[PDB]
Amino acid sequence: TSKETFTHYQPQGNSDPAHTATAPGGLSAKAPAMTPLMLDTSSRKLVAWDGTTDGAAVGILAVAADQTSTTLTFYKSGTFRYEDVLWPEAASDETKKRTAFAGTAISIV
Amino acid sequence: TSKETFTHYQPQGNSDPAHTATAPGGLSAKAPAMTPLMLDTSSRKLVAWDGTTDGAAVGILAVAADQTSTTLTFYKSGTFRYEDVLWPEAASDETKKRTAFAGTAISIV
Amino acid sequence: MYTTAQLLAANEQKFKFDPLFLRLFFRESYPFTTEKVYLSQIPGLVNMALYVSPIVSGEVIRSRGGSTSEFTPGYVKPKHEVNPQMTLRRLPDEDPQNLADPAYRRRRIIMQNMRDEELAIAQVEEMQAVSAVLKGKYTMTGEAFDPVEVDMGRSEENNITQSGGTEWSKRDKSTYDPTDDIEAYALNASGVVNIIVFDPKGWALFRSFKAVKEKLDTRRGSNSELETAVKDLGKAVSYKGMYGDVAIVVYSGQYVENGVKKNFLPDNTMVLGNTQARGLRTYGCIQDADAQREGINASARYPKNWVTTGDPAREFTMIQSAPLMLLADPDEFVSVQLA
Amino acid sequence: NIIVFDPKGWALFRSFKAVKEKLDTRRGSNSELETAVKDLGKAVSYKGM
Amino acid sequence: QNLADPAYRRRRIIMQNMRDEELAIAQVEEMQAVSAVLKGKYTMTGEAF
């Protein structure tokens, strides 16, 4: 009838430790975990990644939050699985997404 | 009569490791510890952050030096407290002050 | 350089901190072993028995029972540092006439830090229970932790607010009797009530009424004995005595915020409660990789000390736990907010 | 010999100072009433005699 | 973590139902008694009666 597919929850893809940080958040919509972020182009607050601005990725959200959260907590180091990252719908190219975090301690493996 | 409070001195804000590096510097005046640095756009020689060029933060100075110092030793990772690090008065709004180091392993708590 | 200062004794500046709640209502602790947790409550109610004639038929009364909820996660971890470069200078103690090696200072600082986390965690454990039996609804909101909201199941009939034009302060001090308000508010309690804990300012107006004072001296009117002419000032929870079958307790405990010290209970509230009301002291599973290796997943607290490698060496100390104060019957208490 | 009351209908019967002074006379009445309610948050109680 | 026989559950349901029956019928006797020794006049009426 209904299957119960069970996969172990392992976001990390390598032994590289995942370091966290906190910074003011300006989310416009509900954002679950593993959501990439950029800085606002004007207020420099943290917003969700659009998937079209090249090089805008700066980190991956660590805990769920909404508009009521003043400060977000996000990962700033380590490697993550490509399938586990909740990519934005606009980013349609796998190659661009795989290298979207280049130049930063975050990596996709 | 007089009081001399003995307070501790903890620049780090988290348990994340704080690495360091060295690079040529082009300072113009005395810069104490924990003065943010930016990379010059003409000769790419490290100078003190002006507090106006957004996104130009490259590191935080770890050892006091002046314009006579050819090589500057700066941190490139870890988490630092807002109240302990010396940021220039040019940046007046706290929100832009917080997220100045985003995109780099350095974070502000 | 030439000062020659001799140091006398030092001070403490201790808090005014006594739980009274992790000791009276929440005597029972249930450690967890799983992720979820349930708290069922049978809605015990009957219907009136209809007068149907014994000729036609009888309706099928719907059966009762069934209500469950979950209050799962919980957590807390107050990490501290050691910063080996603070031991070079001298502590405020350790008089300059007799110094010590900077190795003993590190041990003293570590002991002080450990006491600090112990007090900090004990402070959260009491705050959770204070919210629990003060409103019946609680919220866990904080940085790096999504909000978790707990509906213990309190009804609106047990959250009486005095606000209006007749609460207690717009009444005559000498003619009015406050016992009628007490018996009315305790009507919807669902069980015996025998402690009605007040506030440091919530006891001035209740005692101010002349009716209570005249009831204290009647020679046969009651068996109450309430120690006015203060029994214990400048202290945490005390006992003013007995008011018949119900005791009177005043609690002026304080919890310290980031920089400010705030009272646990608001300025004017009382809680119609029972000492036999069962309270839960559930502790979750310690989600630490090192802890799992010793099989200490189900524990109240978990200390941990460690040191980081590399040429910058730093030690740390942490206490991990998951205090999740719960109440089986939220309707056992009545939280009257005076005015 | 039984004067069964209401739960706040008694709130005004004992408000009369005549009964309160009636309780304490040392030789006046053998009546022994128990105000400062003896049974709280419960069904029917007994206020005494 | 510890289920029960779905035959014992029927027994528990029956016991609870019988307890509810006893309480519901015993409650009518009190309304009748309160009307009786409170006014001496009593209207016994309801739906389909």
XYZ file of C-alpha atoms in Angstrom:
655
model
C 0.000 0.000 0.000
C 2.049 2.906 1.368
C 5.826 2.593 1.608
C 8.007 3.780 4.493
C 11.263 4.701 2.719
C 13.721 5.568 5.493
C 16.961 7.422 4.723
C 19.456 8.494 7.377
C 19.562 12.274 7.829
C 23.186 13.128 6.984
C 23.522 16.616 5.456
C 27.326 16.690 5.610
C 29.260 15.075 2.783
C 32.782 15.145 4.218
C 34.708 15.205 7.495
C 35.021 19.006 7.283
C 33.356 20.487 10.400
C 30.341 22.744 9.877
C 30.733 26.079 11.668
C 27.762 28.327 12.388
C 27.153 32.055 12.672
C 24.386 34.524 13.474
C 23.401 37.647 11.559
C 20.267 39.808 11.238
C 17.599 38.262 9.027
C 15.102 39.881 6.681
C 13.201 36.923 5.247
C 10.214 37.715 3.038
C 8.748 34.188 3.160
C 8.917 31.100 5.348
C 12.292 29.406 4.868
C 12.953 25.835 6.071
C 16.409 24.497 6.891
C 19.092 24.024 4.222
C 18.011 27.232 2.440
C 20.774 29.275 0.759
C 20.954 32.982 1.537
C 22.358 36.214 0.143
C 22.738 39.721 1.526
C 20.175 42.371 0.645
C 21.334 44.582 -2.211
C 20.344 47.737 -0.282
C 19.972 47.011 3.452
C 22.541 44.154 3.406
C 20.186 42.009 5.480
C 20.002 38.248 4.963
C 17.382 37.040 2.472
C 16.748 33.800 0.615
C 18.841 32.988 -2.445
C 17.025 33.696 -5.708
C 19.113 31.213 -7.704
C 19.819 33.797 -10.423
C 22.271 36.232 -8.791
C 25.755 34.883 -9.474
C 28.047 34.659 -6.462
C 25.388 35.840 -4.008
C 25.464 32.675 -1.878
C 27.143 33.301 1.476
C 25.777 30.504 3.639
C 23.118 27.890 4.297
C 20.343 28.376 6.846
C 20.626 26.123 9.894
C 17.253 26.443 11.669
C 13.742 27.197 10.461
C 12.487 30.763 10.814
C 10.034 33.314 9.453
C 9.460 37.077 9.312
C 9.257 37.177 13.124
C 12.911 36.113 13.468
C 15.172 39.149 13.765
C 18.461 37.212 13.618
C 19.142 34.075 11.575
C 21.610 31.286 12.340
C 23.381 29.900 9.278
C 26.213 27.516 8.478
C 29.455 29.068 7.249
C 31.825 26.111 6.740
C 31.815 22.518 5.546
C 30.442 20.503 2.654
C 26.855 19.500 1.915
C 25.158 16.962 -0.326
C 23.691 18.318 -3.555
C 20.430 16.395 -3.120
C 19.826 17.534 0.475
C 20.022 21.274 -0.310
C 16.599 22.843 -0.921
C 17.585 24.806 -4.001
C 15.456 27.721 -5.234
C 13.155 26.936 -8.134
C 14.690 29.610 -10.376
C 18.142 27.958 -10.402
C 17.679 25.383 -13.157
C 21.332 24.622 -14.032
C 22.979 21.903 -11.946
C 26.501 23.031 -12.861
C 25.892 26.602 -11.690
C 24.333 25.394 -8.431
C 27.228 23.018 -7.722
C 29.691 25.937 -7.924
C 27.362 28.581 -6.462
C 29.290 28.602 -3.158
C 32.782 28.807 -4.679
C 34.966 31.397 -2.986
C 33.449 30.528 0.414
C 34.048 27.807 3.009
C 30.722 26.202 2.025
C 31.040 23.515 -0.634
C 28.731 21.096 -2.438
C 29.812 17.471 -2.801
C 36.986 55.904 46.857
C 38.253 55.053 43.382
C 37.191 51.791 41.747
C 39.198 49.791 39.195
C 36.991 46.978 37.920
C 38.905 43.862 36.848
C 37.057 42.516 33.809
C 38.245 39.654 31.630
C 39.181 39.957 27.955
C 37.574 37.426 25.592
C 37.547 38.528 21.931
C 36.201 35.205 20.650
C 32.450 34.725 20.829
C 32.215 31.047 19.908
C 34.293 27.876 20.151
C 35.051 27.850 16.421
C 38.804 27.815 15.682
C 40.389 31.169 14.852
C 43.079 30.711 12.209
C 45.539 33.377 11.080
C 47.525 34.410 8.016
C 50.067 36.992 6.875
C 49.979 39.333 3.894
C 51.711 42.522 2.712
C 50.157 45.649 4.169
C 49.838 49.271 3.149
C 48.658 50.927 6.353
C 48.795 54.716 6.623
C 48.548 55.131 10.413
C 48.585 53.166 13.651
C 45.997 50.374 13.664
C 45.389 48.565 16.981
C 44.260 44.960 17.320
C 40.902 43.959 15.814
C 40.801 46.673 13.162
C 39.054 45.400 10.011
C 41.084 45.297 6.817
C 40.192 45.823 3.174
C 42.040 45.028 -0.040
C 43.121 48.050 -2.075
C 41.740 48.353 -5.599
C 44.900 49.866 -7.137
C 47.833 47.724 -5.958
C 45.836 45.147 -3.935
C 47.819 45.984 -0.791
C 46.018 45.442 2.503
C 44.857 48.629 4.250
C 42.478 49.534 7.052
C 38.804 49.200 6.175
C 37.245 52.590 5.455
C 33.805 51.570 6.729
C 32.111 52.830 3.550
C 33.052 50.407 0.740
C 30.469 47.701 1.397
C 31.616 44.101 1.114
C 35.315 45.019 1.246
C 36.053 43.264 4.552
C 38.855 40.734 4.133
C 40.045 40.062 7.672
C 40.555 41.275 11.222
C 43.976 42.388 12.434
C 45.483 40.335 15.260
C 48.741 42.158 16.108
C 49.240 45.900 16.488
C 51.274 47.498 13.707
C 51.839 50.855 12.030
C 52.704 52.103 8.542
C 56.289 50.857 8.999
C 55.111 47.224 9.027
C 55.627 45.497 5.682
C 53.683 42.345 6.635
C 50.407 42.241 8.576
C 49.097 39.206 10.474
C 45.302 38.977 10.348
C 42.652 36.454 11.331
C 40.646 34.758 8.584
C 38.156 32.657 10.582
C 36.321 32.354 13.880
C 33.614 34.332 15.635
C 34.186 37.686 17.341
C 32.146 39.810 19.732
C 30.761 43.156 18.598
C 31.764 44.943 21.809
C 35.425 43.865 21.600
C 36.299 44.524 17.944
C 37.162 48.103 16.954
C 35.101 49.154 13.909
C 35.469 52.566 12.241
C 32.953 55.309 12.948
C 32.177 55.692 9.228
C 29.706 52.787 9.418
C 26.889 54.155 11.577
C 24.027 51.658 11.111
C 24.351 48.450 13.122
C 22.689 46.169 10.554
C 25.316 46.845 7.886
C 27.993 46.582 10.585
C 26.904 43.043 11.517
C 26.884 41.502 8.027
C 30.117 43.117 6.816
C 32.072 39.842 7.060
C 29.468 37.605 5.395
C 30.904 35.425 2.647
C 34.061 34.858 4.719
C 34.798 32.417 7.539
C 34.914 35.378 9.960
C 31.643 35.996 11.793
C 30.334 38.506 14.331
C 28.165 37.514 17.292
C 54.240 51.232 41.798
C 54.598 52.215 45.461
C 51.122 51.529 46.840
C 51.377 48.863 49.589
C 47.681 48.020 49.816
C 46.401 45.402 52.257
C 43.135 43.639 51.438
C 40.299 42.877 53.861
C 37.460 40.371 53.362
C 35.425 40.188 50.157
C 31.704 40.099 49.427
C 29.353 37.713 47.613
C 26.182 39.467 46.314
C 24.090 36.307 46.118
C 20.704 36.152 44.409
C 17.325 35.696 46.067
C 16.750 32.334 44.394
C 14.714 29.467 45.865
C 12.693 27.298 43.441
C 9.678 26.270 45.583
C 8.326 24.669 42.395
C 10.939 22.027 41.579
C 10.371 20.999 45.212
C 6.606 21.133 45.918
C 4.533 20.434 42.776
C 7.088 18.754 40.471
C 8.474 16.122 42.862
C 8.424 13.406 40.168
C 10.980 13.164 37.350
C 10.541 10.940 34.287
C 13.601 10.654 32.012
C 13.001 10.097 28.312
C 14.328 7.412 26.008
C 12.447 8.326 22.797
C 11.768 11.377 20.637
C 8.042 11.961 21.170
C 6.051 12.272 24.400
C 2.296 12.108 24.983
C -0.024 13.487 27.655
C -3.562 12.123 27.464
C -6.539 13.554 29.332
C -9.949 11.883 29.342
C -12.669 14.550 28.988
C -14.801 13.188 31.796
C -18.317 14.517 31.294
C -21.806 13.042 31.448
C -25.013 14.364 29.933
C -28.365 14.960 31.629
C -30.629 11.887 31.650
C -33.589 12.628 29.394
C -37.183 11.987 30.479
C -38.174 10.003 27.371
C -41.456 8.126 27.647
C -41.180 4.331 28.003
C -43.064 3.607 24.778
C -41.227 4.970 21.739
C -37.433 4.607 22.023
C -34.202 5.855 23.552
C -31.446 7.789 21.838
C -27.895 6.401 21.723
C -25.694 8.654 23.852
C -22.312 9.213 22.202
C -19.427 7.661 24.125
C -16.736 9.915 25.592
C -12.951 9.845 25.867
C -9.957 10.696 23.719
C -7.535 13.633 23.737
C -3.747 13.547 23.315
C -0.916 15.965 22.546
C 2.882 16.056 22.291
C 5.420 18.356 23.969
C 8.603 16.863 22.593
C 11.930 18.588 22.092
C 13.445 20.787 24.837
C 17.147 21.727 25.170
C 19.757 23.918 26.884
C 23.583 24.243 26.821
C 25.466 27.141 28.507
C 29.020 26.886 27.128
C 31.907 28.769 28.770
C 35.558 29.429 27.885
C 38.750 29.429 29.954
C 40.939 31.871 27.945
C 44.303 30.882 29.504
C 45.511 34.503 29.297
C 43.319 35.766 32.155
C 45.265 33.812 34.790
C 48.281 36.111 34.360
C 46.575 38.967 36.223
C 45.355 38.598 39.812
C 41.769 37.913 40.806
C 39.830 40.413 42.948
C 40.416 37.922 45.780
C 43.883 36.535 46.626
C 45.234 39.561 48.531
C 48.448 41.021 47.053
C 50.370 40.326 50.273
C 50.080 36.604 49.400
C 49.813 35.747 45.705
C 49.625 32.327 44.046
C 50.761 30.459 40.957
C 48.657 31.174 37.832
C 47.801 27.468 37.669
C 45.623 27.489 40.797
C 43.777 30.546 39.476
C 42.696 28.552 36.421
C 41.289 25.824 38.678
C 39.383 28.394 40.742
C 37.993 30.039 37.596
C 36.900 26.649 36.245
C 35.122 25.823 39.514
C 33.380 29.211 39.473
C 32.329 28.641 35.861
C 30.925 25.193 36.685
C 28.882 26.672 39.525
C 27.751 29.310 37.025
C 26.332 26.802 34.542
C 24.704 24.852 37.370
C 22.914 27.993 38.564
C 22.015 29.015 35.003
C 20.366 25.667 34.238
C 18.564 25.614 37.590
C 17.233 29.061 36.648
C 15.661 27.771 33.408
C 14.205 24.754 35.200
C 12.312 27.043 37.588
C 11.199 29.489 34.885
C 9.603 26.689 32.875
C 7.585 25.552 35.905
C 6.674 29.156 36.765
C 5.203 29.657 33.307
C 3.594 26.198 33.524
C 1.708 26.818 36.744
C 1.183 30.475 36.112
C -0.571 30.466 32.708
C -0.981 26.906 31.389
C 0.624 27.954 28.088
C 4.317 28.343 27.340
C 6.670 29.314 24.513
C 10.305 28.311 23.954
C 11.724 31.027 21.698
C 15.412 31.785 21.390
C 18.329 32.228 19.050
C 19.421 29.181 17.034
C 16.237 27.414 18.145
C 12.906 27.613 16.353
C 9.906 28.502 18.557
C 8.193 25.590 20.298
C 4.778 26.329 21.783
C 3.224 24.224 24.553
C -0.550 24.168 25.137
C -0.722 22.385 28.482
C -4.519 22.405 28.221
C -5.542 25.260 30.499
C -9.086 26.519 29.998
C -10.145 30.159 30.105
C -12.166 29.604 33.294
C -8.903 29.366 35.289
C -7.338 32.641 34.077
C -9.484 35.114 35.994
C -8.393 38.716 35.470
C -9.577 41.204 38.085
C -9.673 44.053 35.541
C -12.878 46.082 35.582
C -14.219 48.596 38.074
C -14.475 46.366 41.128
C -11.291 44.278 41.311
C -10.050 44.867 44.882
C -8.565 48.396 44.970
C -11.872 50.161 44.211
C -13.482 48.619 47.305
C -13.739 49.842 50.885
C -10.922 48.475 53.036
C -13.052 48.045 56.166
C -16.419 46.732 54.924
C -15.592 44.285 52.128
C -14.737 40.627 52.753
C -12.390 39.010 50.180
C -13.202 35.409 51.163
C -16.223 35.388 48.838
C -13.959 36.137 45.871
C -11.653 33.307 46.964
C -14.486 30.786 47.243
C -15.897 31.913 43.889
C -12.550 31.673 42.086
C -11.790 28.278 43.638
C -15.146 26.858 42.509
C -13.722 25.873 39.104
C -10.620 24.128 40.428
C -11.389 20.397 39.916
C -9.896 19.160 43.173
C -8.905 20.270 46.654
C -6.954 23.530 46.930
C -4.704 24.114 49.937
C -1.910 26.512 48.875
C -2.756 29.877 47.308
C 0.761 31.329 46.847
C 0.757 35.150 46.679
C 3.267 37.797 45.570
C 5.274 40.199 47.765
C 2.899 42.970 46.651
C -0.106 40.652 46.291
C -0.265 40.173 50.061
C -0.418 43.839 51.106
C -3.929 44.405 49.725
C -5.343 41.043 50.841
C -4.159 41.679 54.403
C -5.239 45.333 54.202
C -8.923 44.377 54.384
C -10.268 44.788 57.913
C -12.523 41.739 57.497
C -9.571 39.324 57.533
C -7.992 41.025 60.550
C -11.291 40.865 62.446
C -11.618 37.203 61.432
C -8.183 36.553 62.953
C -9.529 37.355 66.448
C -12.892 35.687 67.095
C -12.091 33.045 69.790
C -14.315 30.576 67.963
C -15.000 32.039 64.506
C -12.241 30.082 62.771
C -9.097 28.054 63.438
C -6.895 30.191 61.184
C -3.582 31.635 62.351
C -1.861 34.045 59.960
C 1.415 35.561 61.153
C 1.231 39.220 60.254
C 3.762 41.490 62.021
C 6.209 40.218 59.515
C 7.493 36.681 60.062
C 10.306 36.566 57.490
C 11.349 39.597 55.445
C 14.261 40.028 53.055
C 14.186 36.368 52.045
C 12.795 33.917 49.503
C 9.629 31.826 49.992
C 8.292 31.799 53.566
C 5.174 30.546 55.365
C 2.711 33.053 56.814
C 0.762 30.245 58.491
C -2.622 28.584 57.989
C -5.966 30.128 57.009
C -8.223 27.244 58.009
C -7.524 24.331 55.676
C -5.535 26.408 53.157
C -2.021 27.622 53.891
C -0.731 31.053 52.882
C 2.620 31.322 51.102
C 4.409 34.390 49.727
C 7.090 33.910 47.061
C 9.411 36.786 46.113
C 11.912 34.818 44.042
C 13.949 36.529 41.349
C 15.547 35.326 38.123
C 18.359 37.250 36.440
C 18.038 38.164 32.767
C 21.016 39.177 30.577
C 21.643 42.252 32.717
C 18.473 42.867 34.720
C 16.980 41.044 37.711
C 13.251 40.372 37.320
C 10.746 38.772 39.667
C 9.443 35.323 38.772
C 5.824 36.238 39.389
C 4.172 39.509 38.316
C 3.320 42.254 40.767
C -0.168 41.080 41.843
C -1.108 37.441 41.228
C -2.230 34.442 43.254
C -2.452 30.751 42.383
C -5.212 28.545 43.808
C -3.308 25.258 43.849
C -2.823 21.904 45.562
C 0.326 20.415 47.074
C -0.776 16.945 45.917
C -1.051 18.042 42.279
C 1.345 15.907 40.259
C 4.019 17.714 38.266
C 6.416 16.234 35.727
C 10.167 16.801 35.572
C 10.762 15.091 32.239
C 14.284 15.209 30.807
C 14.976 14.458 27.159
C 17.734 12.534 25.426
C 21.181 14.140 25.334
C 21.938 14.650 21.631
C 25.727 14.551 21.945
C 27.955 12.097 20.088
C 30.354 11.697 23.021
C 27.483 11.091 25.453
C 26.052 8.270 23.327
C 29.393 6.445 23.510
C 29.049 6.027 27.294
C 25.354 5.107 27.156
C 24.213 8.172 29.109
C 21.466 9.180 26.674
C 18.847 9.225 29.463
C 20.217 11.567 32.126
C 19.229 14.698 34.021
C 22.405 16.702 33.341
C 25.614 16.020 31.421
C 28.869 17.849 32.144
C 31.610 17.871 29.529
C 35.149 19.265 29.470
C 37.434 19.329 26.441
C 40.371 21.154 24.867
C 41.025 22.179 21.266
C 44.197 21.144 19.444
C 46.453 23.371 17.346
C 48.904 26.034 18.432
C 46.025 28.140 19.864
C 44.933 25.922 22.748
C 41.672 26.577 24.572
C 39.657 24.520 27.033
C 35.884 24.581 27.426
C 33.132 23.417 29.764
C 29.498 22.606 29.008
C 26.405 21.265 30.749
C 23.762 19.695 28.512
C 20.212 18.750 29.502
C 16.582 19.095 28.366
C 14.288 20.443 31.106
C 10.677 20.059 30.008
C 8.469 20.837 33.032
C 4.950 19.484 32.505
C 1.687 19.370 34.451
C -0.758 16.482 34.160
C -3.841 18.553 35.067
C -3.566 22.188 33.906
C -7.015 22.942 35.356
C -5.944 22.000 38.899
C -4.775 25.591 39.477
C -6.427 29.000 39.135
C -4.224 31.995 38.274
C -5.929 35.144 39.550
C -4.310 38.377 38.338
C -5.191 41.061 40.874
C -5.433 44.793 40.199
C -31.936 22.189 62.812
C -30.498 22.539 59.272
C -30.131 25.861 57.433
C -28.554 24.696 54.135
C -27.317 27.773 52.243
C -26.045 28.744 48.785
C -22.313 29.024 48.034
C -22.423 32.829 47.803
C -25.826 33.234 49.427
C -23.945 32.743 52.699
C -21.525 35.531 51.735
C -23.999 38.142 53.011
C -25.456 36.224 55.968
C -22.083 36.280 57.740
C -21.364 39.844 56.598
C -23.716 40.999 59.371
C -21.576 42.132 62.311
C -24.293 40.884 64.682
C -23.373 37.253 63.976
C -19.646 38.008 64.208
C -20.070 39.556 67.659
C -22.454 36.695 68.472
C -19.601 34.225 67.999
C -17.398 35.810 70.701
C -19.225 36.512 73.966
C -17.560 33.970 76.343
C -20.949 33.272 77.922
C -23.537 34.384 75.352
C -23.905 31.671 72.726
C -22.747 28.072 72.501
C -22.828 28.435 68.710
C -19.500 27.635 67.060
C -19.479 28.672 63.397
C -16.450 28.200 61.142
C -15.910 31.094 58.733
C -12.677 31.439 56.702
C -14.013 28.647 54.576
C -12.996 25.214 55.848
C -13.516 23.250 52.611
C -12.454 25.020 49.415
C -12.761 23.773 45.845
C -15.055 20.904 46.800
C -18.714 19.895 46.983
C -20.923 20.219 50.085
C -19.108 20.953 53.354
C -20.154 21.581 56.963
C -19.681 25.088 58.356
C -20.188 23.759 61.900
C -22.857 24.559 64.474
C 4.801 0.741 23.656
C 2.472 -1.815 25.323
C -0.786 -2.503 23.491
C -3.777 -4.463 24.779
C -6.162 -7.178 23.642
C -8.926 -5.619 21.481
C -11.295 -7.820 23.482
C -10.305 -6.293 26.830
C -10.854 -2.839 25.319
C -14.517 -3.721 24.792
C -14.769 -4.658 28.475
C -13.222 -1.321 29.465
C -15.656 0.548 27.205
C -18.601 -1.348 28.710
C -17.435 -0.577 32.253
C -17.076 3.127 31.445
C -20.506 3.161 29.790
C -22.132 1.518 32.819
C -20.455 4.015 35.153
C -21.779 6.862 32.997
C -25.255 5.301 33.110
C -25.177 5.110 36.901
C -23.993 8.709 37.258
C -26.518 10.062 34.741
C -29.469 8.314 36.381
C -28.324 9.269 39.887
C -28.163 12.911 38.777
C -31.892 12.987 37.926
C -32.724 11.968 41.499
C -30.929 15.073 42.776
C -32.704 17.493 40.438
C -35.996 15.915 41.509
C -35.088 16.196 45.200
C -33.951 19.818 44.839
C -37.209 20.769 43.143
C -39.181 18.782 45.748
C -37.655 20.296 48.857
C -37.152 23.680 47.352
C -40.641 24.584 46.063
C -43.153 21.751 46.555
C -44.138 22.113 42.879
C -42.349 20.200 40.143
C -42.828 19.914 36.383
C -41.401 16.673 34.992
C -41.211 17.159 31.227
C -38.906 16.775 28.260
C -38.643 15.882 24.607
C -40.870 12.974 23.533
C -42.574 12.916 26.940
